[model samples]
Target: VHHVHPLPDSVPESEDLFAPPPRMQGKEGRPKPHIGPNYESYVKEWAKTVGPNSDEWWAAKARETLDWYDDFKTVRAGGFEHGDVQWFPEGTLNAAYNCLDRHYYKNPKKTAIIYEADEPSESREVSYEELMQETCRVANVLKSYGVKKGDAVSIYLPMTWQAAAAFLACARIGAIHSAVFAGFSAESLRDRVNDCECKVLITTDEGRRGGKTIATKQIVDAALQQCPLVENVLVLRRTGNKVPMTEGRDKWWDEECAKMPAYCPCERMASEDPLFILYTSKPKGVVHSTAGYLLGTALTLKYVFDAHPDDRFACMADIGWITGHSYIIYGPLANGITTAVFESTPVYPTPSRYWDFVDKWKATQLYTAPTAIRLLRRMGEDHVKNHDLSSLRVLGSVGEPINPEAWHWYNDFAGKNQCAIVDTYWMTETGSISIAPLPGAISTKPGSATFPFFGMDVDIIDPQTGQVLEGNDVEGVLVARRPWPSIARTVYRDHKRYLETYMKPYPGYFFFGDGAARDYDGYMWIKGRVDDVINVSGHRLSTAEVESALILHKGVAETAVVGCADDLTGQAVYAFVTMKPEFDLKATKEADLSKELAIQVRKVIGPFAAPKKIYLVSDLPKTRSGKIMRRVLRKIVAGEGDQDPQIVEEVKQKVT
Candidate 1:
């Protein structure tokens, strides 16, 4: 069957971010839309009982929040962070069953995945029933290759349904799936394979993105030269491109899957069984417990993104990252919602490709990086205007803070002032959203993340003293007062590094690593990473602050600010900027947007914090998850006479 769907003519009507007085009720008769509607009422009951007035509210909030999920309610989840912290310890759930089988059996005909290909017209979908069969078949194939319960399989593939199938297949048979992004080099791929000591590697013969094809299998083969532990390399034929397949070790995906029946049974995994390992420096095996990770993922999508059964979620995240694992594949699927899997850049084919996605799929919510939004903003407003975005109910900003300019632009143009912008603040370590406004429930702040979510007990602390703050006009390092269920347990093989890195610094609390400040109204503002701050003439300066100021300019599209070597001041501000098309600077003294931007920064944020230099660039180098790679940008710009030459050397190294 040629998998394709006809386009929709369903141009929608826009709805306001928060409804008028008539729509305050969540349902028809519910009096008031409870805070965080789907999740807040539950937290309110727990908060009142614990201590409504103080930090104790957060502790109970976290506990009660854990119990609100499908598998954890009846299970009494009481464990301290200092000890063996667990969620629903005595409970049981197969990850594949919760995320796949339950939904498939109940509604087999529901569209589970929308595969948006490189070009606009190449998009297709997979039904829940189809997904189940495909995954089970993949599981059977893996089983034949000596992959059983508790073994590790490294998945190096593109953003395809086959990639998703590999993940669910491993979960179905209780094997751990460690996905390395497809864009990584062979050496990077080799390290991740050796780290988990994986026995099987799943990849495509070739990967297509933005009209370019990658030699994916060749990269995998190059990686395996150093990884003989990987006995069988299962290859999916994505582009049908020819590549060398070694006799004994390499096998075809379709041929292997066809040999097995699609009836692999779901393994009965305990609550603490490992689900997946996402590698950063090393793999941070986030949730060894299956249920907690699932529950955390499910609840966040349900509330944070307002993911509904009828909605299609287009999360611009790779399956290799946590966002894709949670939102696009697991979280939305576990809650019985449709998710779109895209395999191209936003600007490929046309600048309107993203807007085209929303209209074509009738996507209700979009989860993307702020960098993507700013990229579109540079293309100009007429891009989104050409297409209808009336179907959008919410726009989510992840990985980094959305400048007030981009927020207003997105709301005004893309959402047409109809949808809410949930600028969420979270990390891979936290697993899901730790701080964000619940769309209509909490008033969205411009640059601020607004409020901590239902359960996260957050505190801005004096980094030097570890003294926690309670009120406004306060700025310090952010730390979680206690651990949340979704918080990562440890790095794969290095518990000592995990302990010293996250736990020991503040003694009891988990150091959040970002400097945050609460305004007079108690809304917390993330001031970039704590270490990213600079001591400019003994005055503290946050890179996020200067970047925020830079983006407000007339033709500024997006900006990144970093602290570099200085003569008098400890560190000076250096900014990398991307301009809107009209403002593209020429290589001349007259082309200095840096001087003009410095003046604006001093006016917007004060004098001493003005940027020392601003270099306009085509684009910012970014992490796989779309966060600005500030360290990479520094290394790219810095030459000889750099204060930290070691940073320049070590940063040449890369991680997935």
Candidate 2:
């Protein structure tokens, strides 16, 4: 009943998250690989026929990409940037059935989820059959609590199989699930649940990460004081830590599920039924439709990550973020592949924890953030040298752009130059990968996110002039010329804000909020946020550019650049940096080291963009997803860092 399998000595070689790959003849009469075997021809032909300009293309893809209960005739309706766009109208299907049931019927014994716990030794794998039973029981429990189609349910749990089951359970019963990050404050949890007006909340007794215990149920208890609409609370007993359970309102997960049957029929959802609501840093939550979102995430995961049928796919993303929703849970499961649910940090217990995970699971595709790679790279290649990472076939970078130094290190050390590195670019609003390389087909240019994916119509425009840029070798604000299937339908209960934020910025295009450049070779380079750009002496500078330049230094491990108040020069640059352990900072004078770091920026970027002040800190404040908190950095530079006590404590204690 443990479902735990003993560690294998080695993984034997094996073979999309859809149908089997269309094959072709190769040398010695061998069959070509499923995806990207004809990368160039497929990309070129897809652009010409199946791009955003063609509704028939979207129509054809919707049918082929997913298994539908009832086929929809209308491909698309409404105009982009002017009106609400509906995709695959009249189609009906259940996301849970597509992700589990269909796959279960075909191969019940196949692994559905690989739960990698906080510690190295405590891990297990869930087969499709077991996952189906668990998901159905959860669904039955929810139905008993008056949860119905079109209702909203909030989830706060760690990266475990139970969390995945809760998500699928909501989809099974046609309930919209909103998952708050386990690391978020109780106030944040209250705001999200209150905003969506959720009637039910699901959480765990506690969460263990990197040897630390998270008071998950305690936080939920505090949040419910303000969440008056939450009539019932379902708590999963993780860690078996004792917690208060209020009478009448709170219910134990195991006790409730024990009464439920092993099979619960899925609620049939229209193609445009609201699937989930994911709250970004913005004030409102973003809503995604079931069928279209599934198609988009599944397709992107197959091509972008180059997923194979039998391979174990690992995406180092928490379920709270969009990456986890699409890649870790929905996308991989929908594509009928094994997804690894990691519940610990990269450098926990040891720096080799991640590499060991790869070796133990023999993960074929490893998708993680640039921050993780840079941190591991700084720890030295010795940790990576301890494991055999030969099973890694595709290396993916998400969250933010990977610097050339980190990219080279990842390709050289982790991938061993045998795998392709996919530098991906997209946002929480996009729902799936917008621009990235198809590892099998496209040649990756270290830092650049190579080309737009199949349906993306990417364009650069001069923000001030409002003119779209043409040809290669141009730089300006980035925008999507058309809508994609997975694009967030609207901000939760705030349609006006959605229009104002994304649509109104440009008259007819979707603003990407980031500045981008096309090099002479036509590879797109993502500059940092346009809003995050610092103005120095009337010259605008991207924070990522300066950070990239600083990272080029041998001594620098990680860096974050922010702009603060200035006098004559308008705004000044301030960099918070972390050094590699090998960099003997104690022996070197602070001024001398800071000056050298500024010089590196001056050489790589220019003198105007050099950091006026560099603070050598041990670590930067980041979200659970590994994105740098630049707003916090700006506050620190402006002398208001005390506003966030926890962050200042971490930075203050860890500062060199």
Candidate 3:
């Protein structure tokens, strides 16, 4: 029985989607005792001592979670309306110290990072002591090159232990770091470096992806032509690809670090000091505060995934995104968990690559995006059957709202029906996990991010009236009622744009751009972005809803929905869909498959929800992060296709 939407009444009770969560600290395989058994009572008991609306909760969390150099006298000050919300106003701490030095004394030999190289046979583990020494050396090298406190540094590297060291090195010396995704164009790199006025840049000589070599230094070399402020280039040799070294500017990373001692003092930073700047888009860099951001990341990882001491965690997100900053690097390191830094494509080597990594590392927790999950599901379960995933205790979903079908597959196949699935929801602006399920506590309703994390006051508001919805079974724009500790302070250079973009929408509430719905149990179901919604005649329909309906079809493997201009209806729904791998496009009739898809959508959702036009494509255009590029789809359907060779090539090959 397929349901149009994931409401309480429509879903079958036999599926056991709302079954009691597995216990922690028991004979059951759950290894951590971080959170309580019951979500309701735990939250209630926690609120009495440290409520979300006040400063007490954040203050307590900050004090306990991190090792502060100077304790805070004040918990929080200012308001969202004023655009000056600050936490731990008088505290001092270094992010790198809390992540490295604090853990080194406890157990120096413990694995800090499990470096999984692109090639299947190659891997290494970095201890807390080893990483700390490397970070200190990098910091000393930076200071030797005249990099001062408060000066910004840019990092362009692949997923490796060196990248982790680079971030910690900057934090140790009180210098803000901006890590650009290595796959981005050099033009993008030039613009970011110029925006931040970074004097020193760190990159690899070359990057390795799926056994293919990338000329990382060449891209940096091209970008430096336009960037006048960058005087030094520190390059790490990865593949040893021959690259030009400019005189007096380029220096090898290992050579510089070898000359320095394996010890550097951590800089004392104020509570609200800038830790790092993350680019949400081209130039809108979001600045996160030192203490507040650290606390948020630490606590969120502790409760959300139930981080355990012996657990081997794998968060398959690149360092460029907020997920990596919070989960993959800062949060896991702060909690002292052994994190896997995977540097290979999910499908490289084989469809079995991820499964093999988990088996080899004995990973207890796996956090990945829905795109990878769906793709693996389409590839068949044979790849999954060969591995022993019994070590997995928690499975997390991020990047987008996961559809019910993919959620079930991830729960059933990867988890083997034992691990808890945590559908986490947050963005670059939030800085950490906002709405998610606690592995040991919350009873997950599949496809719904069960509830808010500690200190998060989430509400659904009517967008037109700007009125906060009062009760359950309501759908509206999502908003954060109060400012949280980890929320982005401001856009890099444009404070006015920050106010207008986030604060101006609802005045008091921090407006989350996504539309959401609450069920009878008050579980939040994200309906993708509000901008992705299309209006047909007079009805406003969610693009995610249509896509979800299409995913229920047995023939469909993946899909992307977009709003196209229509004369009769204000906007028409257009879907670009891919079939299961077995169904060869040359052998299958396009018109017949298109009709079956249209029927499936109409039957699942009403006739009104059926897409007007359907395009059978081999695959959808996606970013390296696995998010479908809807703008590319919109351009092709609207006859505006031009650049972006990948999208145009897909159109010419599959559609033409």
Candidate 4:
């Protein structure tokens, strides 16, 4: 496990260097929103009895918040094999009604979304009332195409206003919407459409990104050839690209909206109704669907972020991923908070693009990945020296375990020492922010996620024995003891896979497959993933998936993939391949072979999965007991394997 400690030359403790922002100060130096009756009472009650072994506190909290607990409670014990998940069995609630109708009725003229286009010159603000009307019109269009409750719609558009409208429109009518990231290859898009068995696909004629035009509709058309389930494709006019359009299948966005009235009745859906399905890649090199992804957004907005109507929340993440789905589009909107959607990179026109946006919008809350921070830090502090970032009140770090250096940089620079930096730790499967600091209440440690959110009970269990760790300051596998509202009810049409991945390992506790430690102060520090999962540039990739691609090279015999510590990316994938003896040659030949392997992997997967380093090893380290010791390989890659007798004995004799 990686031990996180601040550098020796840490920032001085003087108030001049680390003083709290002016706005953050309250009467008598107390933290603002200091432990109100609701949160304070809950925390005091929990600290007195909450521990790793017991979950009584969590269950009580869940029962108090989630309605219909009796009917929705899951009690099955058959490890991922039995395949049963109960969700809001007797409850009724519509996600769109919760997110849109409620907010519209309460605050119609309040800004709900501030969309900044990629061109940097175009931008628009959509209020709750205008958003409702747009969603109603889009919902009416779906109705015209015979879309109804329980149907699935595929959203293949970019991060634009139309994409957001399509998501809410589908949810408003009880239709499950699936968003495919625009960066995905045509094959990946096809796989998602076929898996969801979507009837309608919403896409754009073209998408602009980084000053480049992407043939979005063309790619969708190519994928649709294999997706027979898709009956209609709605193409939004963006970029004015002359693209091929099928007469019966393809429909223009302008024509559809023009035909429908801008006022359609919202469909009342059950609480457990399928809101959307996001496809996440797994260790097995296959995309899996995380179902019941709506409630997670709603609950996170209400409890975790404590979003308000006037708060401008901006999540600097793409809409194709779960972070964008839950935070940018769903969570804030569900809570009636204003959200900003930027369809450009932070380093686009300049390195200070993000700070400029924050200053322009007066964003109260900002959520983004640490990888971005690392990149921005490399650009020098002068990028933000002139920008007025005082408007940011709450900051967040997501996607991976943030290093102490990066966390402090964010708190001091981006937040100006005023905002709470919530180190949010969660996955697509969890649906929401499972473990994080409760912005105004929790005392945060530099790199720790701090504590499990309300209604969540976390346990650090011994991986070998599945027994919960007895005390703090111990490292073990992290698990959730009780189910929460945002937990993915099941994998779409594959409950067995869901159970095998999360529940079967430790029974009753949802296994996260990552290692973590609880410090003496009871703060949870993520020690990175222990399984085949690797985080590359904030995107999760399975080792097996990358290995499968590497093996596609004819010269490769056996391969192993491991994430190495990187200054830029949180973790960079390193590949070790044992080439077939016949293909081996001189040093130049080995260099050529390495290059070939990387290109092959990129071709098989995407460009993002390319290995940073490829080493040609004669053989892998394995025990006489027939188990491959990955620990030895990890040390070898870090140049420390030769120092230990145990690791040297396993690999030295085998190296040719």
Candidate 5:
């Protein structure tokens, strides 16, 4: 790694933000009670007390975001009954007020959202005041179109300023906002739209990412053909593409917004109201509570990343995903902090695009995915050589584990080793960050996801028996012994599926599904999914979903997909399949067969779900009960699959 330019001289000396916090002594030699971290730092938490970060601090911080109607109660009941998982059960508040308007009156001129277009020159910085006005206008226009409280509004736009406004607008009018990734297939879009019964569809004419243009409006039109529930298509003219527009349903965003007032009274919702429905896995939409989601996002950004109100927070994940919902929109806004909304790939225009955003914007805290770090790393340090990134004080890692190599490269090259690196482990179900190191506390392993966030009782238990593991250096399924505020309440209208997936498996625990380990030092290291799901780069794709898509091809008879360790992707999809006689085994090579399978998947799912490699096999190794044995496939294809993964999981422990 080369550093052509040193960090600014004004930057202070490096401090240990991951050092162990003072603990409370309970029984002799028993697992010491966790009190939380205590360290000196430039950034401070709002609920500062005499001791380390505690339950009292967690409760206080959460309460600060809402106007409680009754009393402030944290953790009403437990035992996995779903009887009372509420933080403040009686709380009645407006999501829009806490997220946008609270900061509007306090720091009206402060930058609330920074829009970085695919073309660098098209950037726009939106202030808190401007955000409030735009949100109100959009909300009023939606009401004019007959959108009411609890109705779902499907947002099909890209990472534009209008997408953020549309999200807040839904919140302002007490509607549930559902944002679909712009890259998704029309089939994928239709499923989410129908499930939620979205009447109003917010979209853009086209979206630009890297050098490619996405027909976003056209995709919506195609999806809405099947989604008969959709009544209005509010489209933003982004790419000036001449797309089909029906006279009665289609309307320009600017034209409609111009007719609405700049001030629409925000609605007060119950704490348990659905905030947003993000489909993490296919067909299953995770529902998060409004109050808990807002509180969790705010606290995590402030405590985990040390996101200061005056500081600029640049989160480089796409707004269609969970990272964007947690940070770019609700999190920073709830805390009344400045957060950036970036559109454009990291290597687009140039490899320096990301660093330039930091240096130019003076972004104090930058949250991003490790998949991006690996991509830039392959492009070589030369791509990041000339940019100045001294403005970044707190660097965060999410999506996937940061491999030790990428972690070092990020700190050495991108951050100049001047910032505190916080590797956060979380899920779409876990509203915000579930585990991470506090930026100011400073003790971190290169790739370890580190400690569980405050008020979360995390455990690594036996996968078979569900018995809690006692010591470190052991691997097991990760589970939460207690409920946290941000836990996804249910899967949209399907409470049974929600409980079956996330709740009931462990009886007394909220099964997180993923596997993990705890080191002797008490740091938690996240292993990938314990089920058939694969975490390719940062995106979680289920093998079941992939298999279903693969079988769609006429040539495919039987198929199975498993995640294999890749040098760059962290994990890549490795598929084994049997083809029909029509494709005769003698005719096609591995490349030709793989390409066909990939295309079938890309059409059914999305391009991101395409397999890294698809090997044509006559048969799949399976158990006596006819279940395909993934272990044998892993060993045969992955080479290192012969070795027990328990030890290998430790080696990449410090990455990302």
Candidate 6:
């Protein structure tokens, strides 16, 4: 049995852990208790002290620091009924001012962004002063085009300092900026532009990725005919690719910049302004839009990440996703912290790309998704064996739950057992990291996200009964009991859809649609989508648990488990696995791979939870973003023709 260590003799363990540690106490002034035991107990004590249960905690904290949540009001267009929303309704604020002007005026020389291109050809370091100037110049360029407040502009580009500048420039002038992932197909691009009714579309001549030239402007050109609302097309000369440019509608980004001055007044925006909209694919085959994405971005950076003006932060996610928007662009920037943006893939050029960057840049905090970490682990530790990664102080995992093995690998190998690993959990609708382990202030579990943020009250409810589970060591559906300041007000142009998705399911509670389990220590462990849980013969089993068990096999490289409809069992488990290069799929005579995997699962779980069928494949069907589309797998296993044939073909060809 684990023995509980008494609270440290110095700092009294209180319910409010977030209460600012005594001023001037420094790192030494805080308690140094062993965090292994009673971590949750201590966290609860600290949270109470910080007023976790009070709805006014965030407002009060922001007021004490004069950090801008004071006297905030909601901004709505055509009222809430129209589904158009904004926050800090009556107040005036500037995203650029909050991100750059304040920091530049206070610390002009402080680094603002570190940019790494796809190829190791060049890198850049932009200071707060320089960032302000660049953004001002971009703002002037936009103003020259007669772009003004309330106008919609689309940014379709790769990860770079210019992308960040363009985002700030749009915000500086109060123009809504929508950024599309550079890798999206032309049809996808057309859909987004048409839906948002963007007036100006920004693109680059070319982008480099995976040793290939991407004709970004070409795709934009293909998408333009379908988007009649777009009046201007600004193309940045990135790779010097020759692209067709129409006379009236198309303009060169360099030419526009050359005609503008490097100074523009920052437009003051309301706290609840419609910052930007992101489209996320749902299980229903419809792309959903979440509005008021800025408040959550700003709040998460200031609170959960504990971003400081001096910290150099890096988020390794593509610009098209919410993760990139919140972490790489808006969050750190709003907090006046230096952020690193990487335009290259982690395995590009070589597998050591990520580790090399950390060593070269002395990055203090690193945020990435678990899929990337799994890929890195498969690349072999020898690739980064001797690299000095001592500078990393905090590690973050997002997008999905961090498997315990991968979590340990990150903590032991990548972080050298010294840094904290914050498993941040949130969705596009949440607009920010809703649940996370506070760095330097909270004790974290290897696989758990730890706790909800101050303004959030997360509870687990039994799915069958809809009753809130009591205490730790219980598993149920995860729900937010109270409204958070950063919560997205509504779906774009669809208030009813927003209510149905979040509020209506549970009434006052915001349903996350995810399953969670609380350990005896009070840490929250995510168990993936609640619907993904497999119920076989009246016993429920978590797919993630089964997948974890399969991944532990020495021959397995990656695995995905999904539940298929079974008449007898209600739901049957099906597993698809990808093996390492060293393993031979055809040589089944050498080892009983299927039997071995089945026995492993049985040992880890039980006979009832064992998989009914296992399919050896070279790849699992995934979205462009690397998320396994389990629904597709379920359809494929059921022999349904409605599955996207392209995705099915790709999965069949890649998987053995």
Q: Which one wins by TM-score: 1 or 5?
A: 1
> What tens digits encode model 5's per-residue C-alpha lDDT throughout 1-656?
21111111112214322343221112222222222244333124422421234567656766765655444554333435663466566667778888887788878998888888888888988898998898898899899999998999998888887788899999888899999888678998999999998889998999888878998887887888899889898988888879788898999888888998899998877777887898863488988878878888887887787665577889988777789899888888887878898888889898888988887788877888865775576566777878877666678888755545456677778767666688988888889898887765646666677767756668888765668888766666888877777888888878788888877888778887776777666667665557655777776665445665676565565666888788787888888776654567666676777788798777756677888877666556532112355655665555654452232333223111
lDDT of candidate 3 over 238-354, digit per residue (tens): 877689999989999989999999999999998888999988644798999888898899988988888878878899888888888999889999998899888887888888888
Candidates 2 and 6, the one with greater lDDT:
2
For model 1, give the 10-residue run with minimal summed lDDT. 2-11
Query: Per-residue alpha-carbon lDDT of model 1 for 460-536, expressed as tens digits?
Result: 88876778877776888888866565667677777677777777778777887898887665667787888688779
| Each prediction's TM-score versus the true structure | 0.88, 0.93, 0.96, 0.75, 0.76, 0.88
lDDT of each: 0.74, 0.83, 0.84, 0.70, 0.73, 0.71
Residue 304, candidate 3: C-alpha displacement in angstroms: 0.4
> Which sections of candidate 3 miss by over 4 Å?
1-4, 7-16, 20-25, 45-54, 642-645, 652-656
Candidate 4, residue 537: Cα displacement in angstroms equals 29
Model 6 whole-model lDDT (C-alpha atoms): 0.71
Give per-residue lDDT, candidate 4, residue 382.
82
Off by over 4 Å in 1: 1-83, 281-288, 584-592, 635-656
Better of 3 and 4 by lDDT: 3
Tens digit of lDDT per residue, candidate 4, span 515-578? Answer: 7777765778775667655678866665435665665565555566777778888888888776
User: Candidate 5 vs. truth: CA RMSD?
Assistant: 12.9
- 10 residues in a row with least lDDT, candidate 5: 2-11
Model 1 clashing-pair count: 0
Return the top candidate by lDDT: 3
lDDT of 6 at 5: 17
**lDDT score, candidate 4:** 0.70
Candidate 2, 429: how far from true, in Å? 0.5
**Candidate that would win on TM-score:** 3
Where in model 2 is the C-alpha error above 4 Å?
A: 1-39, 48-53, 639-645, 649-656
lDDT of 2 at 473: 80
Q: Model 6, 310: alpha-carbon shift in Å? A: 2.7
